[PDB]
Ligand binder design. Structure first.
Ligand code: SPH
Ligand code: SPH
Lengths: 232, 235, 246, 232, 60, 60
């Protein structure tokens, strides 16, 4: 009536940046944690997921902010100069690195950030890169259809509610600095702030803990607590 | 002076940005440009150029001249197709390395009507009808001409015209398909069959080859620039 | 039937203009008659096992007519070209010749040393060169040939021959046409450049489909490349340049 | 038709900054890695090269960004203050330094950057410094012509597809700090972002791995993979 | 250049902010939106929808 | 205050730049210029001046 709905808007409901992934990147010796490729998705964490599963479809200009926090591991008295972290985008199809000293890190056409440790967290905006006209938080179908003429069942066997295997590529984070004897273990926390959010077909939120990237559930299927029928 | 606030994302280097930078060589009298022919204003202008397809990719014909020409003849079986390939211009081994596919491998999303110009390289006395069929995905691949003629198709008389343009209209559920091979944004299936076998008179080469050129239409576009998987650098 | 006449040379037959640009001028020295003749290169036989031929322009027209003389006497000259590749074939001959006009047609050498090919072998001229099925490495360390090792399917430049149609191309399909004409404007980073050292264009006649005729064992038909320098203007008249071709 | 060609533009196709070189610069004792002169060219890396070899001629206002990542080498417990790196341009003709403590580092007319380690990567724009009216990615000629009157064959012997030996000079990177016992090995990664790109005479891209600064090739001449003729 | 003064709160990341950021994928032709039914412009529009209450909450 | 974003290339010193800098000696009454002959406005004005060439360069 007289009270405004400003804080309740979809833009305001998702105005907060949510940790969607924590990537561990080390500069150890070649003894696998030199770099790390995290499949870009909000389903690694349940909070922003549940906020998005409130609706069936979404269209938002994402905003990723990388907060890199590094520590000295396996050394009480360790030294290392300020590290630079390369956060490279590998959209579906771009060649993924097989090692730290790989050519794909040249980023000739892959967008990449070079964040100097200690500076402001690395923020970048990304438009709606969805193939469809809206992001599909829920998919009631498959990617393949097992036909009668298929030689085997694995030809058309696809994961339910999975559109594409490489949904939106992988984010490859490495330490651009050369491998130093002093091992510096870093954690890059990615925070996702959906902007210009337009949501469609609202859905009730998950009342049970998530289990995987789908709507499956295994245990903890008791959301409601014990309470009397006539107890206020 | 002016109170400023360093927002998150400062002192970083995002390879994809349009920030200004100090001119290292100021007051530099650059060389004036001349009207050089063949100016390209967009990468898709290169995709629109029809480029021959490595259709044949057998273990003995690939990476040679035999991979660009498909051998068809009167002795060839009519029930079996001439050539077949998925409509994956960036992930299909036949279309991935074509100029269209070469430009698509640098992008993640592609959307447009394709154009397959099949050129006949037989004798002028050689005639026949080739059914070139595009079958959108979601069904069995057209292993037979009876199944191929159900989808989009065009009959090509080898005697009248030596080259037939099979335009694959942009039909897709998503606004943009992915350049990788994935079953959700799969493009379709292009096939060729013998509507009427090749008829050649005497003193004529019974087995003739043909070429295939893939091209992009004006409606064709791409987005989400990326690094191609083709090129590599050992290090 | 198209019958194109330039200067004192007439050719009877479709013609394609490279990059949609016609050869035009930019005090240069422009022979309006002495350099507009359709100089005919050496005819090459299209064997059944042939892999292709390549010529460098204006290197091809270095000893034919007064065009070569003006090219050697003058320092730097710009010249468009008109390449007519005519292949006389009967109704029973099958085959296709991709006639590609590569701007700055850099070819690959045979030796392990990069860019080690010599000037004599890189500028064969009217003779031209030929492609090879595979990449034969030069093994003569005592006396390196220093010649190109052009590969058909690689176009001699590492690119795929299938994509070579990005260049100004014309397909001589013996069933529909026995000749092709490509009009190349002067394509170069500079408005005008030395022709004795720089080759503005490269013509590649590659058999996209093998030549067959009546199921014969060996069939070979002539291919004649006739190049006409259009709007060829030179500048920097000075003593004649006599390159070493060995 | 209705879908825009924004991402496909030449300006957008080269809008990404590509690692073109990695320069190793040390502050070791005079025992050669004190400074390093890298001949400025994109042909040290294959990705941006292949993107440029898509066309015969180019005219772009380059943008070089230097990301310096330093480490402690040969020391588990090493110390050194924040280093300043001098990235000096030596265009064709300018005197090149023969040592770290050379006069040419004064940069009286050579443009130079002094990047403080830990700060934002050193970015600088460079106009089209090409001699011709367009950059020549491909050159079908030589620089010299062996004449009949030459005393020997080496007078006119030049490299094929090589215009000038000193194409665009060398980039000389050093550590401005004095040589400290603690050896700090630094890697300066140069990222090239062509701006205002105008390309001419498109060319198909290299399907085989590069071999040197020309169009030569030695091995790995099998770009296409095995695939059936009638297999979808 | 312009003399600026970094105020307190610089080089921080406040999850609740509307600061601009560089577009990681510039000149990106996004997919045009279609008229999908059930567009929600405010979260309270979901609260206005009457939803059954777990009234009885006995242990069984 | 005003949210700013330090772009790459900050806190560097490019010898070839035209950035402003604080005047170390403000309100400084410089000496007024006089009309000194031979003012050079461009370096090429010196190249246009014909200067003798060391043509002969034998060892002696
Ligand atoms: C440093 C460069 C990083 C560039 C980061 C941009 C990557 C763009 C991917 C963002 C897409 C995430 C939002 C979409 C979520 C999907 O709807 C769900 N995974 C389910 O469909
Ligand atoms: C700190 C000062 C650094 C100044 C850097 C400016 C150097 C200017 C050189 C840029 C030229 C590279 C682009 C040209 C590429 C050429 O076309 C290819 N090498 C082949 O011709």
């Amino acid at each position: 009536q007289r009270r405004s709905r400003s804080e309740s808007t979809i833009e305001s409901f998702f105005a907060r940046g949510a940790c969607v992934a924590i990537i561990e990147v080390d500069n150890e010796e070649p003894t696998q944690k030199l770099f790390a490729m995290w499949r870009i998705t909000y389903k690694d964490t349940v909070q922003l997921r549940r906020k998005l599963e409130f609706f069936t479809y979404s269209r938002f200009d994402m905003e990723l902010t990388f907060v890199v926090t590094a520590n000295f591991t396996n050394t009480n008295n360790g030294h290392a100069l300020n590290q630079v972290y390369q956060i490279m985008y590998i959209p579906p199809g771009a060649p993924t690195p097989k090692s730290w000293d790989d050519y794909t890190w040249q980023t000739s056409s892959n967008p990449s950030i070079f964040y100097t440790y200690g500076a402001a967290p690395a923020r970048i905006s990304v438009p709606y890169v969805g193939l469809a006209n809206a992001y599909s938080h829920f998919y009631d179908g498959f990617a393949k259809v097992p036909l009668k003429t298929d030689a085997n069942d694995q030809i058309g066997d696809s994961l339910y509610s999975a559109m594409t295997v490489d949904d939106f590529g992988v984010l490859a984070i490495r330490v651009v600095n050369d491998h130093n004897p002093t091992k510096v273990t870093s954690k890059v926390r990615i925070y996702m702030k959906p902007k210009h959010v337009r949501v469609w077909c609202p859905r009730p939120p998950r009342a049970v803990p998530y289990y995987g990237p789908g709507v499956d559930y295994k245990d903890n299927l008791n959301p409601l607590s014990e309470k009397g029928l006539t107890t206020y | 002076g002016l109170p400023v606030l360093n927002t998150p994302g400062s002192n970083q280097y995002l390879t994809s940005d349009n920030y200004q930078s100090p001119c290292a060589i100021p007051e530099f009298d650059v060389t004036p440009p001349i009207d050089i022919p063949g100016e390209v204003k967009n990468m898709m202008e290169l995709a629109e150029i029809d480029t021959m397809i490595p259709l044949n990719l057998e273990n003995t014909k690939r990476n040679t001249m035999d991979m660009y020409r498909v051998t068809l003849s009167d002795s060839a079986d009519l029930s079996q197709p001439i050539l077949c390939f998925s409509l994956s211009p960036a992930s299909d081994p036949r279309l991935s390395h074509t100029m269209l596919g070469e430009v698509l491998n640098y992008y993640t999303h592609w959307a447009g009507s394709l154009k397959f110009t099949f050129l006949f390289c037989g004798s002028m006395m050689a005639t026949g009808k080739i059914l070139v069929a595009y079958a959108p995905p979601g069904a069995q691949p057209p292993t037979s001409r009876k199944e191929a003629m159900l989808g989009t198709h065009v009959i090509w008389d080898l005697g009248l015209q030596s080259s037939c343009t099979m335009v694959v209209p942009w039909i897709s559920n998503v606004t943009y398909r992915q350049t990788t091979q994935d079953s959700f944004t799969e493009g379709g299936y292009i096939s060729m069959f013998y509507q009427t076998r090749i008829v050649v008179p005497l003193s004529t080469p019974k087995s003739m080859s043909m070429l295939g050129f893939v091209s992009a239409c004006n409606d064709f576009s791409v987005r989400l620039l990326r690094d191609t998987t083709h090129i590599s650098q050992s290090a | 039937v198209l019958q194109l006449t330039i200067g004192n040379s007439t050719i009877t037959t479709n013609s394609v203009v490279a990059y949609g640009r016609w050869p035009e001028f930019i005090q240069p020295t422009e022979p309006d008659v002495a350099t507009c003749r359709f100089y005919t290169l050496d005819t090459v036989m299209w064997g059944k096992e042939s892999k292709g031929w390549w010529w460098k322009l204006p290197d091809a027209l270095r000893d034919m007519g007064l065009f070569g003389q003006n090219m050697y006497y003058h320092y730097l000259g710009r010249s468009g070209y008109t390449v007519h590749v005519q292949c006389n074939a009967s109704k029973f001959h099958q085959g296709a010749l991709g006639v590609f006009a590569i701007p700055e047609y850099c070819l690959a050498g045979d030796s392990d040393k990069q860019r080690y090919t010599s000037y004599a072998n890189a500028n064969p001229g009217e003779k031209g060169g030929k492609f090879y099925s595979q990449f034969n490495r030069d093994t003569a360390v005592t006396s390196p040939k220093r010649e190109f090792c052009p590969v058909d399917y690689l176009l001699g430049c590492g690119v795929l021959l299938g994509n070579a149609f990005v260049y100004p191309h014309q397909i001589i399909n013996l069933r529909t046409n026995n000749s092709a004409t490509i009009v190349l404007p002067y394509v170069n980073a500079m408005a005008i450049d030395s022709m004795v050292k720089h080759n503005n264009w490269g013509i590649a006649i590659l058999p996209l489909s093998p030549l067959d005729f009546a199921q014969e064992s060996s069939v070979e038909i002539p291919i004649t490349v006739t190049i006409a320098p259009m709007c060829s203007e030179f500048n920097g008249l000075r003593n004649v340049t006599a390159p070493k071709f060995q």
